Design an enzyme around this catalytic site. Structure first.
Site, mmCIF file in Angstrom:
data_model
loop_
_atom_site.group_PDB
_atom_site.id
_atom_site.type_symbol
_atom_site.label_atom_id
_atom_site.label_comp_id
_atom_site.label_asym_id
_atom_site.label_seq_id
_atom_site.Cartn_x
_atom_site.Cartn_y
_atom_site.Cartn_z
ATOM 1 N N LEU B 92 0.865 -1.116 -0.044
ATOM 2 C CA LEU B 92 0.016 0.017 0.104
ATOM 3 C C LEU B 92 0.948 1.294 0.176
ATOM 4 C CD1 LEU B 92 -2.996 1.579 0.090
ATOM 5 C CD2 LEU B 92 -2.590 1.163 2.620
ATOM 6 N N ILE B 93 1.831 1.323 0.787
ATOM 7 C CA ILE B 93 2.480 2.611 1.178
ATOM 8 C C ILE B 93 3.568 2.952 -0.004
ATOM 9 C CG2 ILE B 93 2.214 2.750 3.463
ATOM 10 C CD1 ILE B 93 5.096 1.958 3.811
ATOM 11 N N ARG B 194 -4.813 -1.570 -7.949
ATOM 12 C CA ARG B 194 -4.704 -2.782 -7.205
ATOM 13 C C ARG B 194 -6.253 -3.658 -7.256
ATOM 14 N NH1 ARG B 194 0.387 -3.584 -4.955
ATOM 15 N NH2 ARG B 194 1.194 -1.566 -4.714
HETATM 16 C C1 LIG Z 1 0.915 -6.084 -9.700
HETATM 17 C C2 LIG Z 1 2.215 -5.267 -9.208
HETATM 18 C C3 LIG Z 1 3.461 -5.832 -8.954
HETATM 19 C C4 LIG Z 1 4.326 -5.076 -8.393
HETATM 20 N N1 LIG Z 1 5.561 -5.832 -8.117
HETATM 21 C C5 LIG Z 1 6.538 -5.116 -7.650
HETATM 22 C C6 LIG Z 1 7.938 -5.654 -7.613
HETATM 23 O O1 LIG Z 1 8.178 -6.857 -7.813
HETATM 24 N N2 LIG Z 1 8.796 -4.747 -6.978
HETATM 25 C C7 LIG Z 1 8.611 -3.506 -6.342
HETATM 26 O O2 LIG Z 1 9.380 -2.909 -6.150
HETATM 27 N N3 LIG Z 1 7.518 -3.079 -6.595
HETATM 28 C C8 LIG Z 1 6.686 -3.682 -7.093
HETATM 29 N N4 LIG Z 1 5.201 -3.030 -7.298
HETATM 30 C C9 LIG Z 1 5.172 -1.671 -6.691
HETATM 31 C C10 LIG Z 1 4.993 -0.759 -8.203
HETATM 32 O O3 LIG Z 1 6.163 -0.914 -8.612
HETATM 33 C C11 LIG Z 1 4.683 0.681 -7.723
HETATM 34 O O4 LIG Z 1 5.841 1.299 -6.571
HETATM 35 C C12 LIG Z 1 3.595 1.019 -6.725
HETATM 36 O O5 LIG Z 1 2.343 0.007 -7.480
HETATM 37 C C13 LIG Z 1 2.933 2.471 -6.706
HETATM 38 O O6 LIG Z 1 2.421 2.542 -8.066
HETATM 39 P P1 LIG Z 1 2.878 3.789 -9.175
HETATM 40 O O7 LIG Z 1 4.538 3.386 -9.609
HETATM 41 O O8 LIG Z 1 2.096 3.985 -10.169
HETATM 42 O O9 LIG Z 1 3.405 4.987 -8.137
HETATM 43 P P2 LIG Z 1 2.466 5.906 -7.111
HETATM 44 O O10 LIG Z 1 3.574 6.349 -5.988
HETATM 45 O O11 LIG Z 1 1.315 5.146 -6.888
HETATM 46 O O12 LIG Z 1 2.266 7.141 -8.170
HETATM 47 C C14 LIG Z 1 1.151 7.844 -8.850
HETATM 48 C C15 LIG Z 1 1.639 8.381 -10.129
HETATM 49 O O13 LIG Z 1 2.541 9.626 -9.644
HETATM 50 C C16 LIG Z 1 3.764 9.490 -10.696
HETATM 51 N N5 LIG Z 1 4.759 9.383 -10.001
HETATM 52 C C17 LIG Z 1 5.124 9.242 -8.656
HETATM 53 N N6 LIG Z 1 6.366 9.398 -8.113
HETATM 54 C C18 LIG Z 1 6.894 9.365 -9.553
HETATM 55 C C19 LIG Z 1 8.520 9.595 -9.709
HETATM 56 N N7 LIG Z 1 9.201 9.688 -8.461
HETATM 57 N N8 LIG Z 1 8.835 9.967 -10.949
HETATM 58 C C20 LIG Z 1 7.925 10.067 -11.798
HETATM 59 N N9 LIG Z 1 6.611 9.818 -11.635
HETATM 60 C C21 LIG Z 1 6.108 9.630 -10.391
HETATM 61 C C22 LIG Z 1 3.461 8.326 -11.460
HETATM 62 O O14 LIG Z 1 2.529 9.008 -12.646
HETATM 63 C C23 LIG Z 1 2.744 7.377 -10.784
HETATM 64 O O15 LIG Z 1 1.533 6.510 -11.620
HETATM 65 C C24 LIG Z 1 4.290 -3.964 -7.918
HETATM 66 C C25 LIG Z 1 3.111 -3.428 -7.927
HETATM 67 C C26 LIG Z 1 1.692 -4.048 -8.523
HETATM 68 C C27 LIG Z 1 0.759 -3.205 -8.628
HETATM 69 O O1 LIG Z 2 10.477 4.979 13.543
HETATM 70 C C1 LIG Z 2 9.485 4.761 12.719
HETATM 71 N N1 LIG Z 2 9.905 4.675 11.309
HETATM 72 C C2 LIG Z 2 8.756 4.717 10.462
HETATM 73 O O2 LIG Z 2 8.911 4.570 9.113
HETATM 74 N N2 LIG Z 2 7.454 4.115 11.120
HETATM 75 C C3 LIG Z 2 6.334 3.631 9.962
HETATM 76 C C4 LIG Z 2 6.572 2.646 9.010
HETATM 77 C C5 LIG Z 2 5.522 1.837 8.965
HETATM 78 O O3 LIG Z 2 4.365 2.167 7.925
HETATM 79 C C6 LIG Z 2 4.834 2.332 10.472
HETATM 80 C C7 LIG Z 2 5.441 1.478 11.720
HETATM 81 O O4 LIG Z 2 6.585 1.324 11.700
HETATM 82 P P1 LIG Z 2 7.218 0.291 12.865
HETATM 83 O O5 LIG Z 2 6.563 -1.048 12.835
HETATM 84 O O6 LIG Z 2 8.591 0.204 12.373
HETATM 85 O O7 LIG Z 2 6.948 1.194 14.024
HETATM 86 O O8 LIG Z 2 5.332 3.636 10.692
HETATM 87 C C8 LIG Z 2 7.563 3.991 12.397
HETATM 88 C C9 LIG Z 2 8.297 4.291 13.087
HETATM 89 F F1 LIG Z 2 8.367 4.167 14.656
HETATM 90 O O1 LIG Z 3 2.048 -6.740 -5.848
HETATM 91 C C1 LIG Z 3 2.994 -6.133 -5.555
HETATM 92 N N1 LIG Z 3 2.762 -4.966 -4.861
HETATM 93 C C2 LIG Z 3 3.898 -4.081 -4.151
HETATM 94 O O2 LIG Z 3 3.457 -3.108 -3.663
HETATM 95 N N2 LIG Z 3 5.198 -4.838 -4.256
HETATM 96 C C3 LIG Z 3 6.180 -4.206 -3.716
HETATM 97 C C4 LIG Z 3 6.181 -3.616 -2.272
HETATM 98 C C5 LIG Z 3 7.369 -4.038 -1.397
HETATM 99 O O3 LIG Z 3 8.152 -2.756 -1.459
HETATM 100 C C6 LIG Z 3 7.994 -5.051 -2.419
HETATM 101 C C7 LIG Z 3 7.652 -6.248 -2.027
HETATM 102 O O4 LIG Z 3 6.568 -6.798 -2.069
HETATM 103 P P1 LIG Z 3 5.985 -8.169 -1.912
HETATM 104 O O5 LIG Z 3 6.699 -8.990 -0.930
HETATM 105 O O6 LIG Z 3 4.515 -8.042 -1.712
HETATM 106 O O7 LIG Z 3 5.939 -8.713 -3.253
HETATM 107 O O8 LIG Z 3 7.778 -4.545 -3.895
HETATM 108 C C8 LIG Z 3 5.534 -6.055 -4.813
HETATM 109 C C9 LIG Z 3 4.557 -6.798 -5.534
HETATM 110 F F1 LIG Z 3 4.599 -7.778 -6.089
#
Ligand SMILES: Cc1cc2nc3c(=O)[nH]c(=O)nc-3n(C[C@H](O)[C@H](O)[C@H](O)COP(=O)(O)OP(=O)(O)OC[C@H]3O[C@@H](n4cnc5c(N)ncnc54)[C@H](O)[C@@H]3O)c2cc1C
Ligand SMILES: O=c1[nH]c(=O)n([C@H]2C[C@H](O)[C@@H](COP(=O)(O)O)O2)cc1F
Ligand SMILES: O=c1[nH]c(=O)n([C@H]2C[C@H](O)[C@@H](COP(=O)(O)O)O2)cc1F
Ligand SMILES: Cc1cc2nc3c(=O)[nH]c(=O)nc-3n(C[C@H](O)[C@H](O)[C@H](O)COP(=O)(O)OP(=O)(O)OC[C@H]3O[C@@H](n4cnc5c(N)ncnc54)[C@H](O)[C@@H]3O)c2cc1C
Ligand SMILES: Cc1cc2nc3c(=O)[nH]c(=O)nc-3n(C[C@H](O)[C@H](O)[C@H](O)COP(=O)(O)OP(=O)(O)OC[C@H]3O[C@@H](n4cnc5c(N)ncnc54)[C@H](O)[C@@H]3O)c2cc1C
Ligand SMILES: Cc1cc2nc3c(=O)[nH]c(=O)nc-3n(C[C@H](O)[C@H](O)[C@H](O)COP(=O)(O)OP(=O)(O)OC[C@H]3O[C@@H](n4cnc5c(N)ncnc54)[C@H](O)[C@@H]3O)c2cc1C
Ligand SMILES: O=c1[nH]c(=O)n([C@@H]2C[C@H](O)[C@@H](COP(=O)(O)O)O2)cc1F
Ligand SMILES: O=c1[nH]c(=O)n([C@H]2C[C@H](O)[C@@H](COP(=O)(O)O)O2)cc1F
EC number: 2.1.1.148
Lengths: 242, 239, 246, 243
Positions: B92-93, B194
C-alpha cells in the site's frame, strides 16, 4: 483596470469520527482528524497524557516534537484572484499543492485587469507608467488576435482556429496581467509555503499572499499555525517567522 | 491467535463553501462541487453556457471523459483501515501520493496481536490452523525476547529498544492499522492498479471496498469503474 | 527586438557500475543498464532464458509493455533549455515530478532580453514585427520603471535584496514572449509522461516543439525506453508523438 | 538459519556534460558540477564574479548556507542494498521522494531466505539463537503452506500464477527479520532529508545504521554537499549524524 488581491477559503476537511474507536475530543474538522491520525500510531485512544488531553494541546505537541507527516491528513482550498502571472509562476514551483488556474489559451484577455506590484502601490507616477504600458499591450493583443485568426482562416474547425490565435496573441500580455487560481494544500504543505514565502527573502506580492493565507489558516486550525509570528518590517510589509 | 477481519471506515471528506462573488451555483455539495468549481475556474465558465454540462453530474462526466484528471485532486477522502496485514501495508505505502499514519510496532505492544488470514486460505480450516499455530509460536518468542531484551538493556526507551528488536519475529500476517488520505485522482489510480487480477488478493479486496465507499460518496467521479467477479469469487474493477 | 531560437542541450545522464558480486551483465551501460538491473532485482532473475528479453533493449521493451513503469524512475536526464518563453515555462513547471532551476527576473538584467516568437507566427514577417515592436516598448518601460525604483529602494543596505526589490517590480511590464532559460531534470518515467501530455495536438505549439526535441534527444541516450513513441507530422507541419502505452 | 549482514553498494550516479556555448567551467565533474551549473543558471552568473564561491566546493557550501536546497535535486545516487530486514524496508519506503525496486515475496521463492539480526541482539549469542530457531520454524511452515497451497490451487491451469497465488499466501508466516534487497535512488536533497531523519537517536537502530553507511558513501561522492553532517558515537557504540 487594476485588481486587488482577494483570497477566499472555499474548502476544508469534514471529519467523521469512527464510532467503534473509544476516543473523543473537543474539536471538529481537520484539527480533529489530525489528532485521530496521531493517536492511531500509538493506539492512544484514552489519552494517558494529561497535558495532551485537549485537541489544541495535542496539535501543539505534534509540532513541538516535529511529527509533521500527521498534519498531511487535513487540507484547505482557496480561490485566489488579483494575483499576477509573475506571482503564479512562483507559486506553482510548490509541488505539494494542487492547482486549477485561469487559462490564457482558452479565455479571451482583451479586457484583462492588471495587478500593481506592491513596491509601487503608493507611487502614482509608477502606477501610471504601468497601466499605460498594459493598455498598449492589450491593444497589441487584439491586433495580433485579428490577424492571427485571418491567418489561420484555412483551419476548418473554428474553435481550434480561435485557440491557435489566442495562444500566439497572448505572447504580448505582460507579467502583471491578472490571473485566478484554485490552490489546495494539506496543512504541512501550507506551513512550508508560509515559511518560504512570508519571508523578507521572497517577492513582496507572494509574501502578501502567504500572510493572508496564514491569517485564514490560523482561524481554521489555530494550534497548527500558532508558532508563526507575524511582524512588520520598516516598510510596513509583514513577514511571518517560526 | 485471534484473527482480524478487514474493516474500512470513511473518516474524512471535503466541506465546500461556494465563494459569494462568483456568479455560479451548483446542485451538488462537498467534493464533487469543489471539483466542478475548480474546472470552471480554468475557463471562467460560471454561467451554464453548455446545457449538457450544466448539472454537477453532467460536468464531472465531461471532466472524466476528456481526461482532465488534475481537477480531481482538489477533493480528498480519508479512511481508517483495520484488519489489514503487514505485507498488505508494505505494498500500500508504495503509493506515494497518499498520506499515512500507521500503528507502530516500535511503540505498541504486540503480545496480543491479531493475525490476518490471506484470502486464499480463508475458507480452509487446515491452512488457517497452520497459520494461527505459527502466529502463536511467534508471539511466544516475541514475548520471550522482549523479557530478555528489557533485561539485556531510561525505562521507556529500554522498553522501546527492546520492542523494536523483539518484533523481528512477528510474521507478515500480523494485523496493523492505518489512516490513509488521498485526493480523488490518487484514489482512482490506486483502484486501477490494485483492484486488478495482477494484484495480491488482500490488497485487491481492500481496493474494491475503498472503491465501493468512494463511489457512494462521489458517484460521478467513480462511475467508470465496473466491478466484475472472477471464477475464484474475488472481484476486480476495470475502467 | 532580438529573437531567441529554441535550444535544448543535454547536460546530464546516469553513470552505472554493476555490483561485481551479482552474476549478471548486459548489452548496455548508463541509465538503460541501471533500469534492467533494478527490474531484475525485484525477481532476482539474473539469468537469461528468453531470446526476446535476453538483451537490454529486449528487457526494457518488455518492462514497458507489461507496465512496470516504477523501474524507469532510477535513471535521470537533465537539459539546459534556452529560447523558451515565460508562457512556455509557466506550463512546463506544472509537471511536478521534475526538478527545475530557472533564470530569475527578480535578479537577472532584462533590459536587453530576447523574445521568443510563437511558432504560429514564425513565417509571417509582419506579425513578427508587431510582436518585436511591442517587446521593445515593454523593455523601454521596464528600464524607465527600474531607474525610478532603484532610487526608491536605494536605502536598503543588503545589495541582493535592494536589487531584487527594484527588478521584481520593474518586470511587471515584461511580456509572456520574454526569453527564459531553465535546467530541467527528470527520471525516465517523468520524461515519458511529459512527452505524452505535451507532444500532442491538444498542447500549445511552443511546448509541443520542446517536447518533440526532448524525445529525440532522450531516445538517443536511452534506447528502447522511448521507442514506443512514434513521431508524426501533422498537416500544418508541426510534429506530435504518440504511444499506445501513454 | 543463514544471517545476512548489511551491505550497501553504490551502483549509479550523475554524469555531467557541460554545454558548449555557456562561458563557464569549474573544478569538479559529475553531480557536484551539475548542481553548480543549475545554481548559476538562476542568476546567469557564469563568469563567477564572486571569488569566495569560485571553487565548486565553495559554491556548494554557499548553496547549503543560503538554504537553496531545490538546486541539489538535479544530481542523484543509486544504491543496491542487501542484508536489510522487511521491517527496515517498511520504514525506508515511507520516504516518498526516493524511487525503489525491491525483491518481491510474491514472485521470489523464500525457502532459502536469510535472516537479518537486529543490531540490538548482535552481541548476544543466546538471543541470536532464539531468533534463528524461530526463523527456521517459520521457514518450514512457509514450505508446508506452499505445497498445501499449490495443491489447493489445482483448479488453476496456469502454472506460473498458480505458484504465485501459493507464494503470496504462504509468505504470511515469514518474519519481519526476513532479508530483503532493494535498489534505492534519490537526489541529493532527498538523501540529506533521509540522513537527517534516520541517522538520529530517535530512529530504529537498523535504519540508523543504514543511513550512516549511505552518508559515508555519499560524502565520498559530493563532500561539500554532505560536510555539515557529523558522525558522533553515542554511549552505546551506535552512531548518529547531526547537522
Ligand atoms: C501487480 C504489481 C506488482 C508489483 N511488483 C513489484 C515488484 O516486484 N517490486 C517492486 O519494487 N514493486 C512492485 N510493485 C510496486 C510498483 O512498482 C509501484 O511502486 C506501486 O504500485 C506504486 O504505484 P505507482 O508506480 O504508479 O506510483 P505512485 O507512487 O502510486 O504514483 C502515482 C503516479 O505519480 C507519478 N509518480 C510518482 N512518483 C514518481 C516519480 N518519482 N517519478 C515520476 N513519476 C512519479 C506516476 O505517474 C505514478 O503513476 C508492484 C505493483 C503492482 C501493482
Ligand atoms: O521509526 C519509525 N519509522 C517509520 O517509518 N515508521 C512507520 C513505518 C510503518 O509504515 C509504520 C510502523 O513502523 P514500525 O512498525 O517500524 O514502528 O510507521 C514507524 C516508526 F516508529
Ligand atoms: O504486487 C506487489 N505490490 C507491491 O507493492 N510490491 C512491492 C512492495 C514492496 O516494497 C516490494 C515487495 O512486495 P511483496 O513482498 O508484496 O512482493 O515490492 C510488490 C508486489 F509484487
Ligand atoms: C492540453 C492541456 C491543457 C491544460 N489546461 C489547463 C488549464 O486550463 N488550467 C490549469 O490549471 N491547468 C491546465 N493544464 C495543466 C494540467 O492540468 C496539469 O497540471 C499539467 O499538465 C501537469 O500534468 P499532471 O497533472 O499529469 O501532473 P504531473 O505534475 O505531471 O504529475 C505526474 C503524475 O503524477 C501524479 N500526481 C502528481 N501530483 C499528484 C497529486 N498531488 N495527487 C495525485 N496524483 C498526482 C499524476 O498521476 C500525474 O499524471 C493543462 C494541460 C494540458 C496538457
Ligand atoms: C523516529 C520516527 C518515528 C516514526 N513513527 C511513525 C509512526 O508511529 N507512524 C507512522 O505512520 N509513521 C512514523 N514515522 C514515519 C514518518 O512520519 C514519515 O512518514 C517518514 O519518516 C517519511 O518522512 P517525511 O514525513 O519527511 O516525508 P518524505 O516522504 O520523506 O518526504 C520528504 C519531504 O517532502 C515533503 N512531502 C512529501 N510528501 C508530502 C505531502 N504529501 N504533503 C506535504 N509535504 C510532503 C515534506 O517536506 C517532507 O519533509 C516515523 C518516522 C521516524 C523518523
Ligand atoms: C526567496 C526565493 C528565491 C528563489 N529563487 C529561485 C531562483 O532564482 N530560480 C529558481 O529556479 N527557483 C527559485 N526559487 C524557487 C525554489 O527554488 C523552489 O522551487 C520553490 O521555493 C519551491 O519550494 P521547495 O523547493 O522547498 O519545494 P516544494 O516543491 O514546496 O516541496 C515541498 C518539500 O517537498 C520536498 N520535495 C519536493 N520535491 C522534491 C524532490 N524532487 N526531491 C526532494 N525533495 C522534494 C522538499 O522537502 C520540499 O521542501 C526561489 C524561492 C525563494 C523562496
Ligand atoms: O495547455 C495548457 N497547459 C498548461 O500547463 N496550462 C496551465 C499552466 C498554467 O498554470 C495555467 C494557465 O496556462 P495558459 O495561460 O498557458 O493557458 O494552466 C494551461 C494550458 F491551457
Ligand atoms: O523568489 C523567487 N521565487 C520563485 O519561485 N522563483 C522561481 C519561479 C520561476 O520558475 C523562476 C523565475 O522566477 P522570477 O522571475 O520570479 O525570479 O524561479 C524565483 C524567485 F526569484
Amino acid at each position: 483596470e487594476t485588481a486587488p488581491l482577494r483570497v477566499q477559503l472555499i474548502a476544508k476537511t469534514d471529519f467523521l469520527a469512527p464510532p467503534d474507536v473509544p476516543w473523543t475530543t473537543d474539536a471538529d474538522g481537520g484539527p480533529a482528524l489530525v489528532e485521530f491520525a496521531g493517536r492511531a500510531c500509538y493506539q492512544s485512544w484514552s489519552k494517558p497524557n494529561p497535558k495532551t488531553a485537549t485537541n489544541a494541546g495535542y496539535l501543539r505537541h505534534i509540532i513541538d516534537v516535529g511529527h509533521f507527516s500527521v498534519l498531511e491528513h487535513a487540507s484547505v482550498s482557496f480561490y485566489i484572484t488579483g494575483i499576477s502571472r509573475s506571482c503564479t509562476h512562483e507559486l506553482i514551483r510548490h509541488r505539494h499543492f494542487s492547482y486549477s488556474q485561469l487559462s490564457q489559451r482558452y479565455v479571451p484577455e482583451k479586457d484583462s485587469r492588471v495587478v500593481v506590484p506592491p513596491g509601487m502601490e503608493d507611487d502614482a507616477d509608477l502606477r501610471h507608467i504601468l497601466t499605460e504600458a498594459a493598455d498598449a499591450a492589450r491593444a497589441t493583443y487584439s491586433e495580433l488576435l485579428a490577424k492571427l485568426e485571418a491567418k489561420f482562416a484555412d483551419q476548418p474547425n473554428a474553435i481550434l482556429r480561435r485557440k491557435q490565435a489566442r495562444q500566439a496573441a497572448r505572447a504580448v500580455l505582460p507579467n502583471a496581467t491578472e490571473t485566478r487560481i484554485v490552490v489546495t494544500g494539506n496543512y504541512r504543505a501550507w506551513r512550508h509555503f508560509i515559511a518560504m514565502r512570508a519571508s523578507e527573502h521572497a517577492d513582496v506580492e507572494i509574501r502578501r499572499l502567504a500572510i493572508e493565507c496564514l491569517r485564514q489558516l490560523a482561524a481554521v486550525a489555530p494550534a497548527v499555525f500558532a508558532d508563526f509570528e507575524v511582524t512588520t518590517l520598516a516598510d510596513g510589509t509583514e513577514v511571518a517567522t517560526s
